[PDB]
Design an enzyme around this catalytic site. Structure first.
Site, short mmCIF file in Angstrom:
data_model
loop_
_atom_site.label_atom_id
_atom_site.label_comp_id
_atom_site.label_asym_id
_atom_site.label_seq_id
_atom_site.Cartn_x
_atom_site.Cartn_y
_atom_site.Cartn_z
N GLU A 152 50.18 5.63 -6.30
CA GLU A 152 49.50 6.50 -5.35
C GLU A 152 50.44 6.80 -4.18
O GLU A 152 50.90 5.88 -3.50
CB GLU A 152 48.22 5.80 -4.86
CG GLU A 152 47.61 6.33 -3.56
CD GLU A 152 46.69 5.32 -2.86
OE1 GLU A 152 45.49 5.62 -2.71
OE2 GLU A 152 47.17 4.22 -2.47
N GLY A 189 49.23 -2.41 1.01
CA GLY A 189 50.02 -1.30 0.52
C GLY A 189 49.28 -0.35 -0.40
O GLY A 189 48.16 -0.62 -0.85
N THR A 190 49.92 0.78 -0.66
CA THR A 190 49.50 1.77 -1.65
C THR A 190 49.19 1.13 -3.00
O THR A 190 49.73 0.07 -3.33
CB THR A 190 50.62 2.81 -1.79
OG1 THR A 190 50.42 3.84 -0.82
CG2 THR A 190 50.66 3.40 -3.18
N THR A 191 48.33 1.74 -3.79
CA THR A 191 47.99 1.11 -5.06
C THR A 191 48.83 1.62 -6.24
O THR A 191 49.14 2.81 -6.33
CB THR A 191 46.45 1.08 -5.33
OG1 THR A 191 46.19 1.16 -6.73
CG2 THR A 191 45.73 2.20 -4.59
#
Lengths: 250, 242, 235, 237, 243, 102, 233, 198, 241
Positions: free
Chosen positions: D40, D23-25
């Site tokens: 993010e 996943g996105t950070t």
């Protein structure tokens, strides 16, 4: 959350075996040896207190349990399974009998009820059978002394003397040689102590042996005087001191 | 083999696709919508000559203005017909008017959805999809004469003409050629009978086929055998001269 | 509880297989009574026989059962049959007709056959009973929920051998005493033990009771089995 | 799921972790009197309305939550978090302490590792706020495992983000300020976007500070957001 | 994929693999704990490991205050540890409400043991991968140590240890009691019992400890409390000027 | 004891012509001997060219009007936007009222 | 590795994927194309309907939810009925209880939560339909894209279904033009109709082929079919 | 107040039941049959509360017929009356009890004896040579105490009832519009459809 | 709550549990029905595994549902008891609410409905049973015969057979039963029933049983001897060159 396994985990195999019951019996085989002997004036149930490290306090574990003032139980197989059956048995002696008739159940009927609980675990969805065999010793006014074995299937049978667990084969043989219908209680205890030596590897003293009797009424264990119509419990656990005294003259 | 409402990698529901295969094994049912009515016709397909042919009920009334033909596992259609009749009668009870054909179809299609192993709904009271397709024909003031195909997917399609069952692929092609927006009711009757004659794996007579229609003025009527036989005389004679 | 490609019920067929390894029980129906006889599964000297009951159970005062199968599964069905009989008596002020009790128990078994995902009961019964509609009656029920009536029948181990012998020696005009004799002889020939002793048997009769006009249930005591074994020349 | 593997681990939980790492950070930074959160947001397409697909979520009025993994799973958790906060407030009157709130999610996430009929959550959640006795920051893994943190990171660029947080902890033992942590968060998100840069991104920050927000959860918008975007752009050219 | 490996049914040898695997899980945190009894106190010690620099170390604990009088240390992963802790807290509060006196150490051990037994028997529940050591100064029984495991087993102890290096610590402790000929630490103050506990932790593990490498819980009559780092430092200073 | 009913007074009048109808009401709202409002409408346009008033206990009246308006909305959703005829409305209102027969 | 892990929605694969959800998403890639786009005053839905035969009706793909909200579908149509039905109730509840029109964003959040449960419950299945939601509320016009995974995103324009990429590409480039079409409904529809055409190997969209919906400032959500769409071809 | 009379002679049971149905100030019916046949040899008569009366009778009727077909056998009058009793005894403690009194007249073929059972709405059952429900019992019990003999013929039984009816038509306040009389013996149930103007 | 779906579709569109239930029917003893001008006759067979049975008490294969309708079955005996009970309850229930006994069609639709229901419910298996249901409508003379099967399909038959070797007997009836001229007598109708059963059964000894239904609840089972009368008259007479 919630239960998905609404189906029986014990089913018939093509040969007609109930696998899970067989495996439950196998579990009982590994169990520490326990025995029961029926005398004319009593019953004795006995087992070994296999301790895991000497740091453990053997006395805190109940291998031999009072179910009613006249009925006791011992087991071989899985300890935690035993412990919960003792609780349910004690309760059912009340809910199914004492609260109805104002008296404790006779041995064969309490045994019948434990048997029922164990059978249900053989057919209900989402459960495995209990991995213990029980020896239940008791007395009631109309049947006198009795001793029963209960197996994982829920099957029970009365014995004059028997043994279950690791060294059961050899011990059943030993008792067959020594049992007659004329034994006094003290004799059955002595025979029980002999049979149990064959089982144990290490120490064999009052602190590694759990033994109880169903004998006479113990009025000084009742907790009160003034009602002549009961003179106390027939179940008694022998102390560590009392086992040792019978071991010196063994 | 794993579950009921499972998706294939192609994104279709296994059980819904297999129920469709069950329908392809069914007896043929054909419907034709016109401006003078909608005709429904079926292939009886008795399994034996000892079967009393008119005990085969593959065309059923739903309300005076709504009729129904079925194909596939016809036993599954009993509780769909029952639900449709209750929906139509109930609507009249709550609203003092006829249910619309589209509304009735949507309700039957709503029922069709209710499959699943105790699935996350409210609540699915059905273990598998229906193994039966339905052609629902009728009339209502707003949208006039109408024909609907109700699959056990919960999808329904309106049609000018449609065939379902074992002979449907061949029947549908013939329906594409023959259908036009100016067909009379009598022409439609002959056309259903004609296409049924083509795809019946017997020789079509009044005992192995059944005709029915719905008109605004007279409602849904099943044709009895004598009236059908006259059209079967009329078809063969029309198809002699040409 | 599912079908095989053949149209058999897997778990049922396997339960019947399970029963075929259990001690044999025989039912013989006479003109003036019924005999129940059962063999205890490979026993021992220390096994108490006095207070022991494992194959023969009283259902009410006019009806008994012989059990072949899982002892614990049977206790469950015996208890509900005992309750059903009492419900009937309370409702009607009349003892339950044997057939009705039997049908009820068979319907219970059938259920486990058709729904619920639970395993069937590994039990077969022989029912011995009396009522004033049909007199003496012998029934059998197995895990499929099927039930049939019999002049003579056997369940559990070696039923093929036992059935052959009963068809050989049974005749319609038999008395209870000849039936007792027939039952014991049949078990003598079919045992896996050396010979047939008293401590390996359970025995019951349902008689018209010498003189009264009333029905009597006798579950034989160990000594009574030992004695009835002598007269018949098996000692 | 109700299945241990022979190594004593739970293989279904283990696989949920993979979905998180995918996943996105997102990050959390604790400061002297508060906490800052940043995520993010991958700009899939120019058609995404800027500033209009909010990822950070409030719980009660004093708690922020951000997460990486399956976004719908994160939403499920926050909804439960809200019912749990409400039910604490109803009974005890006081708003819910952050360590208390942590255990509520902890227990609930852990319950979905007990039964074979349920799957574990496919998210790691970073959340926190200010309560009766200070600021708190927590991270909660799919197993239900959680601890307090000085700084926390999860998602595709977790490794590079963690190293940056480590550098802050070591160089600011005296504590960071809310105002500074905001800029630092913008920096860290830019410096985790390196490992997810096959696509353009939008930055979202929120914070909860005793002096800057009176201990309420608030988004960082306008001047302050731009100042942070500026500062993060500055230290990379 | 043989079902006896995935749910709690018996294997042909009469075994329960899921339970065995739950035992394996207990060591996952690579932490050792030990418990000893004094004259009128009970002491628990557990290693404390905080690898990540980002962690707030005051939150990393495996010791729990179940009630005023009972403490519990867990060997196993924290989510399962916390679950057991929440349930025990509830059970102890329930007991007190229904029965009018504080739940004794062994009765809560027994109750938790029973709950675990159920996961052992029912298919839809996995066992918890934890060993729980319960401690208190019981009003009837005195200093008490009771330990439960994923099998549903539980027993009382003179002393005990749990973790990867359990065997070493146990034998070390056995050897002390063999020699001293008593079943407790003959010391008036709880501070000296902690000191004893840490000392034997050091000998058995072959490791020195700083103040942030340990965690200490002490049970006294009517209290269980955990030590601060500074309290532990004072304990470590005292063992330095002796051993 | 709690009395769940009140009386908000108020009178309504309907007249049908050849190709029109009127439904009229006063705008006064009362409790006992007090005036709550001089202008509280109680005749409503319900869509589909139906007007409705439910006069008596204004709370019950408001609930019924709401439930009928909502009924019209769902009728449109369920029946491809068909106009609800006045006889169909009437029947539907019978069911609304009768569901509360007790 | 792709083996036993697509049995139910309650199982992760070793990669961290939920395959049944991935397969549900696939039912969309097979659905007929639909387009969404908005300016600042209006939002428009364009849906190319798909027939079964030349004798059949192009099955409807636009469903009204309130006076200010509606959606278009691609994939399992019955699933669009369950979801829009739920949206109808949610919009309704908002009106009855709060006298408040439901914000498009809340509608998005509600659909997400509903779809999520079905990705976690045993015995259930994910929804097999994508939805484009348009509305006009107190903060203007909005377009949302719903995926059955439970992911919802707000956009200026988008398209879903078979060969949606052409329309999505066209919209990415037409962005600055269409977003400015304020107070001019017909030009926004026009932009949508030409947007959908970049996705037709098919054929030329006909009168029974095309379905249009609009909502905006003083314009309740309304659907155009056939006669009323003729002027847009 | 509905007249429900029963008299057990030597070889039969006779039931006599009033024909009037009265609601308020109107006699609505003058030919009501307050009787359901339960099986070929068992008849039940009933009186009580307006709706409960027929619903109970027909529910009992359905149940006994079901039993017959399931067992291809007729339950004895004793068995039928025990079933009825238990039903009423259940009803009395439920949310809304059946307010119905019954007479059960049957010929037991296994015993070759006629039997008459009286059961009230409470589930109070008793076997009697003669019985009645309601007010009519206040006249007939003493009458039959005098004129009844255990060994009467069916024809003598019918003369006994004639006396009972006559006494009720003289002293009862309400017009019950005569009785329908039915006989239950070895052969079954027949109606003496000529009693009212005899 | 066990609701795991057992009756499901196969790729070729078959419900195998329903299919295998039909196999259990073919495994079951033969049953046959033929309807005449003023009657319908039902006929069954008895198996030969064991012959020490008591027949006074053993359940006959023809069951009365109400006084005017009978049901016979092939397949699992235990399953058929459940259908028979439900059918009996329905018959009484219909009498209670409609004040008329069931038409034979209605009772058939009900039983077929029950079998259908068991084809689409979680955690139940279909009935391994197929039925023949015969009788007369109240106040009617026209004879009635219906067949149901595990799927819940039902239909009426001039004559029909079910169970083991029914393939063979349906062969006979298709050649012999004339639609024009039903067997006009009870006697000649029992004749066609015995003939058709003779192809399968062997010796009509303790195996063949027969029941006759006439209008207005007139249902009589035949006796061993009255059966033997037809056995003797056909075997010797219809054996000529």
């Amino acid at each position: 959350m919630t239960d998905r396994y609404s189906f029986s985990l014990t089913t018939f195999s093509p040969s007609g075996k109930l696998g899970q019951i067989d495996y439950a019996l196998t579990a009982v085989k590994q169990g520490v040896t326990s025995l029961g002997i029926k005398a004319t004036n009593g019953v004795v149930i006995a087992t070994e207190k296999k301790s895991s490290s000497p740091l453990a306090m053997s006395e805190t574990l109940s291998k031999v349990s009072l179910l009613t003032p006249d009925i006791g139980a011992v087991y071989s197989g899985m300890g935690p399974d035993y412990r919960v059956l003792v609780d349910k048995s004690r309760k059912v002696a009340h809910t199914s009998y004492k609260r109805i008739y104002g008296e404790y159940p006779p041995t064969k009927l309490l045994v019948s009820e434990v048997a029922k609980i164990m059978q249900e675990a053989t057919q209900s969805g989402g459960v495995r059978p209990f991995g213990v065999s029980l020896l239940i010793a008791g007395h009631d006014e109309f049947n006198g002394f009795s001793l029963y074995q209960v197996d994982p299937s829920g099957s029970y049978f009365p014995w004059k003397a028997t043994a279950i667990g690791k060294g059961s084969v050899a011990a059943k043989t030993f008792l067959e040689k020594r049992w007659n219908d004329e034994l006094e209680l003290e004799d059955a205890i002595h025979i029980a102590l002999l049979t149990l030596k064959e089982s144990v590897e290490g120490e064999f003293n009052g602190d590694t042996i759990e033994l109880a009797i169903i004998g006479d009424e113990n009025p000084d264990l009742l907790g009160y005087t003034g009602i002549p119509t009961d003179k106390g419990p027939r179940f008694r656990k022998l102390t560590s001191q009392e086992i040792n005294d019978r071991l010196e003259a063994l | 083999d794993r579950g009921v409402s499972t998706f294939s990698p192609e994104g279709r529901l296994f059980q819904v696709e297999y129920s469709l295969e069950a329908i392809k094994l069914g007896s043929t049912a054909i419907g034709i919508a016109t401006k003078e009515g909608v005709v429904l016709g079926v292939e009886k397909r008795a399994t034996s000559p000892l079967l009393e042919s008119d005990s085969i009920e593959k065309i059923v009334e739903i309300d005076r203005h709504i009729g129904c033909a079925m194909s596939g596992l016809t036993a599954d259609a009993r509780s769909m017909i029952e639900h449709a009749r209750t929906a139509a009668v109930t609507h009249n009870l709550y609203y003092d008017e006829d249910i619309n054909v589209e509304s009735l179809t949507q309700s039957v299609c709503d029922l069709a959805l209710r499959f699943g192993e105790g699935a996350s709904g409210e609540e699915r009271l059905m273990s598998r999809p229906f193994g039966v397709a339905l052609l629902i024909a009728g009339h209502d003031a707003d949208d006039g004469y109408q024909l609907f195909h109700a699959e056990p997917s919960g999808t329904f399609y309106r049609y000018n003409a449609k065939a379902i069952g074992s002979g449907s692929e061949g029947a549908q092609a013939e329906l594409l050629n023959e259908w036009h927006s100016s067909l009379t009711l009598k022409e439609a009757e002959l056309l259903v009978l004609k296409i049924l004659k083509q795809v019946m794996e017997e020789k079509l007579d009044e005992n192995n086929a059944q005709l029915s229609c719905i008109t605004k003025q007279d409602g849904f009527k099943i044709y009895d055998n004598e009236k059908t036989a006259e059209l079967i005389k009329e078809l063969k004679e029309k198809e002699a001269a040409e | 509880t599912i079908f095989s490609p053949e149209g058999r019920l897997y778990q049922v067929e396997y339960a019947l297989e399970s029963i075929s390894h259990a001690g044999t029980a025989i039912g013989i129906m006479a003109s003036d009574g019924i005999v129940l006889a059962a063999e205890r599964k490979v026993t021992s000297t220390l096994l108490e026989q006095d207070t022991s009951t494992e194959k023969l159970y009283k259902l009410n005062d006019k009806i008994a059962v012989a059990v072949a199968g899982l002892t614990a599964d049977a206790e469950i069905l015996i208890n509900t049959a005992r309750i059903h009989a009492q419900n009937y008596l309370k409702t009607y002020n009349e003892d339950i007709p044997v057939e009705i009790l039997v049908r009820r128990l068979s319907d219970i078994k059938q259920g486990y056959t058709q729904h619920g995902g639970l395993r069937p009961f590994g039990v077969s019964f022989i029912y011995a009973g009396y009522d004033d509609r049909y007199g003496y009656q012998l029934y059998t029920s197995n895990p499929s929920g099927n039930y049939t009536g019999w002049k003579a029948i056997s369940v559990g181990a070696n039923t093929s051998a036992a059935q052959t012998l009963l068809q050989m020696d049974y005749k319609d005009d038999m008395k209870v005493d000849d039936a007792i004799e027939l039952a014991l002889k049949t078990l003598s020939k079919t045992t896996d033990s050396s010979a047939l002793t008293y401590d390996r048997l359970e025995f019951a009769t349902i008689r018209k009771g010498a003189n009264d006009g009333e029905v009597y249930q006798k579950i034989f005591k160990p000594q009574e089995i030992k004695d009835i074994l002598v007269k018949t020349g098996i000692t | 799921n109700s299945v241990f593997s022979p190594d004593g681990r739970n293989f279904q939980v283990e696989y949920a972790v993979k979905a998180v790492e995918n996943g996105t950070t997102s990050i959390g930074i604790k400061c002297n009197d508060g906490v800052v959160f940043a995520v993010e947001k991958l700009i899939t397409s120019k058609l995404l309305v800027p500033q209009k697909n909010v990822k950070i979520q409030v719980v009660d009025r004093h708690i922020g939550c951000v997460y990486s993994g399956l976004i719908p799973d994160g939403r499920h958790l926050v909804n439960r978090g809200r019912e749990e906060a409400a039910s604490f407030k109803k009974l005890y009157k006081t708003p819910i302490p952050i360590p208390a709130f942590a255990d509520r999610l902890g227990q609930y996430v852990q319950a979905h590792t007990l039964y074979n009929s349920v799957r574990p959550f496919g998210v790691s959640t970073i959340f926190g706020g200010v309560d009766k006795n200070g600021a708190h920051l927590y991270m909660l893994e799919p197993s239900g495992s959680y601890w307090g943190y000085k700084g926390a990171a999860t998602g595709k660029g977790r490794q590079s983000a963690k190293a940056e947080l480590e550098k802050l902890v070591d160089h600011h033992p005296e504590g960071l300020s809310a105002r500074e942590a905001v800029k630092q968060a913008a920096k860290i998100i830019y410096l985790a976007h390196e490992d997810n840069k096959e696509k353009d991104f939008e930055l979202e920050i929120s914070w909860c500070s005793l002096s800057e927000t009176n201990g309420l959860h608030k988004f960082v918008k306008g001047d302050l957001l731009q100042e942070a975007i500026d500062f993060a752009q500055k230290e990379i050219n | 994929a043989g079902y006896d490996r995935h749910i709690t049914i018996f294997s042909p040898e009469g075994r329960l693999y899921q339970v065995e695997y739950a035992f394996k899980a207990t060591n996952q945190t690579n932490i050792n704990s030990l418990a000893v009894r004094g004259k009128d106190c009970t002491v628990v010690i557990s290693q404390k490991k905080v690898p990540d620099k980002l962690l707030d170390p005051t939150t990393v604990s495996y010791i729990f205050c179940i009630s005023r009088t009972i403490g519990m240390v867990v060997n196993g992963p924290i989510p399962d540890a916390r679950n057991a802790a929440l349930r025990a807290k509830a059970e102890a509060a329930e007991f007190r409400y229904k029965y009018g006196y504080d739940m004794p150490c062994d009765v809560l051990a027994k109750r938790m043991a029973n709950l675990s037994q159920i996961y052992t028997q029912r298919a839809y529940m996995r066992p918890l991968g934890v060993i729980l050591t319960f401690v208190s100064v019981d009003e009837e029984l005195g200093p008490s140590i009771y330990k439960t495991d994923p099998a549903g087993y539980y027993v009382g102890y003179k002393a005990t240890a749990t973790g990867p290096k359990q065997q070493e610590i146990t034998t070390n402790l056995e050897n002390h009691f063999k020699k001293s000929k008593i079943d407790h630490i003959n010391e008036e103050s709880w501070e000296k019992v902690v000191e004893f506990a840490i000392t034997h932790m050091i000998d058995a593990l072959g490791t020195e400890f700083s103040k942030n490498d340990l965690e200490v819980g002490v049970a006294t009559k009517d209290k269980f409390f955990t030590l601060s780092a500074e309290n532990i430092e004072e304990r470590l200073v005292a063992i330095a000027e002796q051993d | 004891q709690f009395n769940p009913y009140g009386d908000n007074g108020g009178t309504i009048l309907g007249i049908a012509g050849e190709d029109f109808a009127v439904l009229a009401g006063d705008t006064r709202n009362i409790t006992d001997y007090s005036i709550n409002s001089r202008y509280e409408p109680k005749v409503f346009d319900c869509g589909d060219n139906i007007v409705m008033s439910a006069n008596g206990f204004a709370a019950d009246g408001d609930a019924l009007v709401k439930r009928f308006k909502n009924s019209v909305k769902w009728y449109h959703f369920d029946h491809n936007d068909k106009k609800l005829s006045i006889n169909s409305a009437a029947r539907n209102i019978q069911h609304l009222l009768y569901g509360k027969r007790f | 590795f792709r083996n036993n892990y697509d049995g139910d929605t309650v199982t992760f694969s070793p990669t961290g994927r939920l395959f049944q959800v991935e397969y549900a998403l696939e039912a969309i890639k097979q659905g007929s194309v639909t387009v969404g786009l908005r300016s600042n005053t209006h939002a428009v839905l364009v849906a190319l309907k798909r027939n079964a035969d030349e004798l059949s009706s192009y099955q409807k793909k636009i469903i009204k939810c309130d006076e200010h909200m509606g959606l278009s579908l691609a994939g399992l149509a019955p699933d669009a009925r369950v979801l829009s039905n739920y949206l109808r109730q949610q919009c309704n509840y908002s009106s009855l209880v709060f006298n408040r029109k439901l914000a498009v964003e809340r509608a998005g959040h509600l659909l997400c939560d509903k779809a999520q449960k079905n990705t976690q419950s045993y015995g259930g299945r994910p929804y097999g339909v994508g939805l484009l939601i348009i509305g006009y509320d107190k903060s203007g016009a909005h377009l949302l894209e719903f995926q059955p995974s439970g992911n919802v995103t707000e956009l200026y324009g988008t398209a879903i279904g078979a060969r949606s990429q052409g329309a999505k590409t066209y919209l990415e480039r037409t962005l600055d033009t269409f977003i400015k079409i304020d107070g001019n409904p017909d030009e926004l529809i026009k932009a949508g109709v030409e947007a959908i055409s970049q996705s037709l190997r098919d054929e030329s969209l006909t009168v029974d082929n095309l379905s249009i919906a609009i909502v905006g400032k003083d314009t309740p959500f309304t659907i155009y079919d056939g006669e009323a769409v003729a002027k847009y071809i | 107040m509905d007249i429900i009379l029963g008299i057990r002679v030597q070889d039969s049971v006779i039931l006599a039941s009033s024909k009037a149905v009265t609601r308020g100030i109107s006699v609505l019916k003058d030919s009501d049959d307050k009787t359901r046949q339960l099986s070929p040899h068992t008849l039940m008569s009933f009186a009580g509360e307006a709706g409960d009366t027929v619903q109970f009778a027909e529910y009992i009727q359905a149940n006994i017929q079901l039993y017959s077909i399931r067992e291809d056998y007729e339950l004895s009058p004793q068995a039928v009356s025990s079933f009825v009793r238990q039903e009423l005894a259940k009803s009395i403690r439920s949310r809304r009890p059946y307010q119905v009194n019954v007479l059960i007249g049957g010929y037991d073929k296994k015993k070759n004896k006629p039997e008459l059972y009286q059961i009230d709405y409470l589930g109070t059952k008793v076997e009697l040579p003669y019985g009645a429900h309601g007010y009519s019992g206040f006249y007939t019990f003493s009458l039959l105490d005098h004129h009844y003999r255990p060994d009467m013929t069916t024809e003598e039984g019918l003369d006994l009832l004639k006396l009972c009816v006559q006494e009720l038509e003289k002293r009862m306040p309400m017009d019950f519009k005569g009785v329908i009389v039915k006989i239950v013996d070895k052969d079954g149930i027949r109606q003496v459809d000529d009693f009212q103007a005899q | 709550g066990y609701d795991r779906a057992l009756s499901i579709f196969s790729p070729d569109g078959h419900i195998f549990q329903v299919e295998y239930a039909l196999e259990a029917v073919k495994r079951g003893t033969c049953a046959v029905g033929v309807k005449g001008k003023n009657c319908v006759v039902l006929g069954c067979e008895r198996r030969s595994t064991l012959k020490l049975q008591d027949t006074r008490i053993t359940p006959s294969k023809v069951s009365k549902i109400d006084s005017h309708v009978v049901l016979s079955f092939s397949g699992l005996n235990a399953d058929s008891r459940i259908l028979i009970e439900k059918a009996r309850v329905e018959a009484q229930s219909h009498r209670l609410t409609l004040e008329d006994p069931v038409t034979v069609e209605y009772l058939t639709r009900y039983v077929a409905g029950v079998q259908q229901r068991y084809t689409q419910s979680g955690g139940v298996r279909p009935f391994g049973v197929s039925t023949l249901i015969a009788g007369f409508d109240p106040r009617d003379d026209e004879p009635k015969l219906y067949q149901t099967e595990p799927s819940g399909i039902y239909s009426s038959w001039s004559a029909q057979t079910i169970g083991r070797n029914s393939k063979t007997v349906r062969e006979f009836l298709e050649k012999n039963y004339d639609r024009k001229e039903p067997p006009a007598t009870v006697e000649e109708c029992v004749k066609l029933t015995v003939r058709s059963l003779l192809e399968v059964v062997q010796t009509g000894a303790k195996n063949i049983e027969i029941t006759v239904v006439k209008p207005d609840s007139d249902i009589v089972a035949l006796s061993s001897e009255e059966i033997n009368q037809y056995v003797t008259q056909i075997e010797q007479e219809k054996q000529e060159q």
